[PDB]
Design a protein around this nucleic acid. Structure first.
Ligand SMILES: [Mg+2]
Ligand SMILES: [Mg+2]
Ligand SMILES: [Mg+2]
Ligand SMILES: [Mg+2]
Ligand SMILES: [Mg+2]
Ligand SMILES: [Mg+2]
Ligand SMILES: [Mg+2]
Ligand SMILES: [Zn+2]
Lengths: 49, 49, 50, 87, 40, 82, 592, 73, 21, 48
RNA sequence: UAAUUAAUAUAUAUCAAUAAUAAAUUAAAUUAAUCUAUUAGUCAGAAAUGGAUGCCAGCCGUUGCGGUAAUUUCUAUGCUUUUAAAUAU
């Protein structure tokens, strides 16, 4: 999943950060999952990974 | 024919005009006669075996 | 064996049954999902590999 | 599931009703407009009940009795029943 | 007397492959550290 | 034996099995779930000793093996002496 | 809500007649070049596959080995004339370069070289030049590079062979193979090619085509791609020659086990040589060393030109054999039991004590009694599991396992009819009339054999009126018809035939579509052709075991059916797999 | 055990005994977009079912009897 | 069936199939 | 064993049919009785 | 010993009694008799463009949509479906 959260850096400044949930897996017996909140889409994807 | 033993001259397909034939089933299709060669020669052979 | 003094050989003492003579190479058998044109696997024709 | 909204179907999926009035009502904000509400009548065990339902149907040449079905929720608070066809 | 057959147990996921072990887990396979005597 | 001097102009490419396939952008069914949802009837490897008059295992294996050996030219230049 | 309030069901483009015709169909003008010889179907002009024979049921295929000769018309095959094998220019090349040693010249050694070489060979002193290469290794290197430098093409130009010429010799040779001929071939293939088949990679495809000097479709783009990717590693990293170079467990080499150990002994009295005596030779674990002993025996046999004991693997592994038999009978399956399916029982620490003191205190008259191969077996069940495979040993040892006896069909005496001829017509009729008894003492499956037992006097009673009016006892089949159907399949020796397979299940359950049943070339079923003999005729009877229907056929029907995914609305339970039905159907007239 | 190690045994089907050892090749419908994205941006990680294919990024392809416990590679 | 060995893979000499006149 | 017992015997009919097919089919290293000469093999062999 | 060469009863009812019975290509080892048989979606989530409309008309399983550019209304046309239908209880 992808999602959007508002991140308030100050009473004026507002950023749109997005939110990633994913899971890495290999059917050979090893998996893992991650989630992250980052500024861009690609960023949150890499962070989650 | 090496498969259904119908005569080559007078018959186009395997199982034509045979009541008990395996080679023609209800909504299935007709199969052309198959020709002698090393394949069916050693088929006959393996059956004899 | 009848008086129970015979050394037991049970199925518990058996290890793996090994592959001794390796069978054959199993060559890739052409399926309906292996086709060099994306067309031959259509939605109107192919509902799956087999 | 909300089981008290179905009170006048009385355990039936569809109802038959007679037309009486058609008035208009304004939906709950922030939805503006006019929702057409038909005021209908039907009888059960010789009691005459006045049913009040949402008119979503298509009216052609003048006709009397409708077929009532229950839905989910709608813009307009208080109106549970909807119209299927008019006979 | 065990009517579930080990012959048919599983769910086809279609294309998804999974690994299986013939006998033991592959990590347990080569024991050479006790065999060739590399241990503290 | 049974030789003619023949010209064969086009042999298809190598049967390495790995060739970059034809690329598309859009697909017909946009529904990837069908990949994971698809089942089939069971493939049973064997019935009763696996006897057949057409000898399938042997014959098909050898026929594959032949053109494989042809294309690698009998794997005869590839290995040095270790 | 209701879709049809204010409009009826929409019939808009219900034929979708834009899909019916392409406005261009066909003619009597079809180009003979691009169509079939019969104008039946359009030819396919993409590059030739070499495997085509597997998908088509044409029998002229199997008359020849390689594909382009299978495709060859008879008129051309007539024009291949039989000539000596070296008159084939590739056979000539093979004769000159590989087979003729006598024409091979080696660089002559100087006297200094001769001396340094000799004294290196006889006595090794460390720090020396590691090469000292045997002229054997050298020779074989020259040969393998002669296989490297062999290229095909026009032979009025430089190179020796047409490609066609090469595969021609190859084809003549592959047809020419005996049993042990193509055995040597397949061994050669398993040893060299097959591992390479596992270690390949796209990075090699150009090199992979450099063997035959064949030109690829993409050749420039592959040049670039492979250049960039081989850039990312050592050149030694990427060459396929060196990818097989190391092997685990260097203490015992396969080369050194080719001469089997103490073959001059256990040949001469193989009974005095149980696996133990030899197993003390190897520093490996149990399974591995028994494996190796099997291979020794086989190599030895093939070496001495006699046939090997095929019962030997069963004899050395006997415990594993019986464990697999009983497992196969327990969990119902055919194969070899693997780890996941073992019992989860946890024994105590000292669990083995009883057997330990039984072993420690054992005593034996001779050493043959100590290890005979058959000490694994006590009860009759043991002997029945150990030999179930040979119908020789099994038939001789367990005669009572094939029923040769049955309760004879006997005619009952008729009850006298006092009415005489007036009624004699009555019991004589159109049909047979079966009558099976029921009651409190009869019809219970639990008791079935006791009820069919001819010794039991309370035995369930059947009778049959034949159409001529007589009465006879039931045939055993007819008796068994009156019990709920019983399935007998025993998995322990040969695989019983199992329902819901590919070749078993008829179309509508297997696929949701009608699929035509033709005995030729089912692509969906991955078969090339079918000769369709009577199922149990040519096969041996002991091989027929039974059938097993006792499971859910998951493609077809499963328990607790639900939607895999609720949104999008399109997915259903995993049993609903199916192709899309078109916009309205078009019917093409089909004599064609 | 004495050379190159054990095979890497996979299956596509119901069981190990009921399926084929082979994965599906690159020519599959569902693998083409993925393999594309994987050819063009090689260095970043890519979503897809194109992982399940016999073909992949790494020089070691998934095909039957890969010896995965072998020292080289 | 023998034609496949002499064709050039990209060339499909008469994609329509119709000779016409 | 049946041969050594005397039960099965090789007859003259079996023998001569055996010889017949031994003649009339291709031998791996040699030319066989019932190999037909080809006039046009001179293209290669050099003699008609 | 009314009758068993019988199970057929035409067009009525009550409360039952699950019929879209290979719903789509090679044909029915008949006795050829009953039937001419279709719906949905198209924001989210398989599938879109024109044209209107402008907090209106309307949609509403649900978050919600409609403020002249609405992938959420209406209409036209295509396109999507894993094919005994949508919808209501
Ligand atoms: Mg209620
Ligand atoms: Mg609402
Ligand atoms: Mg004890
Ligand atoms: Mg979508
Ligand atoms: Mg709507
Ligand atoms: Mg406007
Ligand atoms: Mg629009
Ligand atoms: Zn035939």
């Amino acid at each position: 999943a992808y999602d959007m959260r508002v991140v308030k850096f100050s009473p004026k400044d507002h950023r749109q950060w997005i939110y990633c949930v994913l899971y890495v897996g290999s059917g050979k017996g090893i998996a893992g999952w991650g989630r992250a909140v980052a500024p861009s889409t690609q960023e949150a994807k890499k962070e989650a990974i | 024919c090496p498969r259904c033993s119908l005569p080559y001259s007078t018959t186009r397909y395997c199982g034509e005009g045979d009541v008990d034939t395996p080679f023609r089933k209800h909504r299935g299709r007709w199969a052309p006669h198959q020709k002698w060669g090393r394949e069916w020669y050693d088929v006959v052979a393996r059956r004899a075996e | 064996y009848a008086r129970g003094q015979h050394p037991s050989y049970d199925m518990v003492y058996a290890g793996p049954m090994p592959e001794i003579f390796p069978m054959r190479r199993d060559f890739r058998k052409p399926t309906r999902w292996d086709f060099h044109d994306i067309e031959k696997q259509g939605k109107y024709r192919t509902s799956g590999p087999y | 599931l909300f089981f008290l909204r179905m009170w006048f179907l009385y355990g039936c999926c569809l109802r038959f009703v007679l037309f009486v009035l058609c008035y208009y009502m304004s939906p709950r904000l922030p939805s503006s407009g006019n929702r057409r509400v038909l005021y209908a009548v039907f009888y059960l065990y010789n009691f005459v009940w006045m049913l009040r339902c949402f008119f979503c149907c298509f009216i052609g040449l003048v006709m009397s009795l409708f077929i009532i079905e229950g839905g989910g929720f709608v813009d307009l608070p208080g109106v549970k029943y909807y119209t299927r066809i008019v006979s | 007397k065990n009517l579930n057959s080990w012959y048919t147990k599983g769910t086809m996921r279609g294309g998804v492959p999974r690994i299986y072990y013939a006998w033991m887990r592959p990590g347990s396979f080569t024991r050479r550290r006790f065999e060739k005597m590399r241990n503290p | 034996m049974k030789y003619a001097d023949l010209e064969l102009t086009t042999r298809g490419e190598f049967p390495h099995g790995m060739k970059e396939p034809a690329f598309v952008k859009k697909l017909d069914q946009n529904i990837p779930w069908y990949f994971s949802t698809y089942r089939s009837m069971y493939h049973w490897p064997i019935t009763g000793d696996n006897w057949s008059d057409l000898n399938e295992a042997e014959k098909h294996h050898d026929l594959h093996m032949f053109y494989t050996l042809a294309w690698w030219k009998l794997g005869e230049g590839i290995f040095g002496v270790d | 809500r209701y879709p049809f309030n204010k409009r009826g069901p929409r019939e808009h483009k219900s034929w979708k007649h834009h899909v019916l015709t392409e406005p261009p169909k066909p003619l009597q003008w079809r180009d003979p070049k691009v169509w079939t010889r019969d104008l039946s179907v359009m030819k396919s002009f993409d590059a030739p596959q070499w495997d085509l024979w597997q998908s088509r049921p044409r029998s002229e295929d199997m008359d020849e080995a390689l594909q382009p000769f299978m495709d060859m018309p008879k008129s051309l095959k007539d024009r291949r004339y039989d000539i000596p094998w070296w008159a084939n220019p590739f056979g000539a090349w093979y004769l000159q370069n590989i087979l003729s040693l006598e024409l091979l010249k080696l660089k002559s050694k100087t006297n200094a070289e001769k001396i340094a070489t000799y004294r290196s060979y006889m006595r090794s002193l460390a720090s020396g030049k590691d090469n000292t290469m045997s002229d054997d290794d050298v020779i074989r290197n020259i040969i393998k590079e002669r296989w490297k430098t062999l290229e095909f093409g026009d032979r009025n130009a430089g190179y020796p062979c047409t490609f066609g010429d090469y595969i021609q010799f190859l084809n003549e040779w592959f047809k020419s193979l005996d049993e042990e001929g193509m055995q040597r071939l397949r061994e050669h293939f398993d040893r060299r090619i097959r591992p390479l088949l596992a270690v390949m990679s796209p990075v090699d495809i150009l090199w992979l085509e450099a063997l035959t000097q064949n030109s690829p479709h993409n050749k420039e783009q592959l040049q670039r791609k492979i250049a960039f990717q081989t850039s990312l590693g050592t050149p030694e990293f990427f060459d396929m020659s060196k990818r097989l170079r190391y092997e685990i467990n260097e203490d015992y080499k396969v080369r050194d086990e080719l001469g089997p150990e103490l073959f001059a002994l256990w040949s001469k009295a193989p009974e005095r040589w149980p696996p133990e005596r030899l197993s003390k030779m190897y520093g490996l674990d149990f399974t591995l060393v028994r494996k190796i002993l099997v291979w020794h025996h086989f190599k030895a046999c093939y070496d001495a030109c006699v046939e090997p004991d095929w019962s030997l693997p069963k004899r050395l592994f006997a415990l594993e054999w019986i464990r697999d038999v009983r497992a196969r009978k327990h969990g119902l399956f055919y194969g070899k039991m693997r780890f996941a399916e073992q019992k989860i029982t946890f024994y105590s620490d000292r669990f083995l004590f009883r057997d330990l003191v039984n072993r420690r205190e054992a005593s034996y008259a001779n050493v043959w009694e100590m290890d005979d191969p058959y000490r694994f077996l006590q009860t009759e069940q043991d002997y029945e599991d150990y030999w179930g495979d040979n119908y020789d040993v099994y038939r001789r040892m367990f005669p009572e396992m094939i029923g040769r006896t049955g309760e004879p069909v006997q005619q009952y005496g008729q009850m006298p009819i006092w009415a005489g001829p007036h009624r004699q017509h009555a019991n004589k009729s159109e049909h047979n009339w079966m009558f099976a008894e029921i009651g409190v003492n009869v019809g219970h499956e639990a008791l079935k054999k006791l009820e069919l037992d001819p010794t039991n006097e309370k035995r369930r009673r059947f009778v049959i009126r034949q159409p001529d009016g007589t009465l006879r006892s039931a045939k055993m089949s007819e008796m068994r018809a009156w019990y709920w159907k019983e399935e007998w399949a025993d998995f322990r020796f040969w695989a019983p035939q199992m329902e819901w397979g590919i070749e078993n299940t008829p179309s509508q359950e297997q696929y949701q579509e009608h699929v035509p049943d033709t005995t030729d070339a089912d692509f969906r079923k991955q078969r090339r052709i079918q000769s369709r003999p009577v199922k149990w005729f040519y096969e041996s009877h002991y091989t027929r075991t039974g059938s097993f229907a006792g499971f859910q056929p998951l493609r077809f029907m499963q328990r607790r059916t639900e939607r895999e995914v609720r949104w999008p609305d399109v997915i259903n339970a995993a049993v609903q797999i199916q192709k899309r039905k078109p916009a309205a159907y078009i019917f093409k007239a089909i004599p064609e | 055990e004495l050379q190159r190690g054990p095979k890497l045994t996979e299956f596509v089907g119901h069981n190990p005994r009921n399926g084929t050892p082979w994965r599906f090749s690159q020519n599959t419908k569902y693998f083409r977009i993925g393999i594309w994205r994987d050819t063009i941006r090689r260095n970043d990680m890519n979503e897809g079912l194109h992982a399940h294919s016999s073909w992949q990024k790494s020089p070691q392809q998934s095909v039957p009897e890969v010896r995965f416990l072998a020292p080289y590679p | 069936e023998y034609y496949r060995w002499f064709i050039q893979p990209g060339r499909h000499p008469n994609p329509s199939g119709l000779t016409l006149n | 064993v049946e041969y050594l017992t005397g039960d099965i015997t090789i007859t003259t009919v079996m023998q001569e049919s055996y010889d017949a097919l031994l003649d009339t089919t291709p031998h791996p290293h040699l030319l066989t009785n019932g190999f037909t000469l080809e006039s046009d093999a001179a293209k290669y062999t050099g003699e008609v």
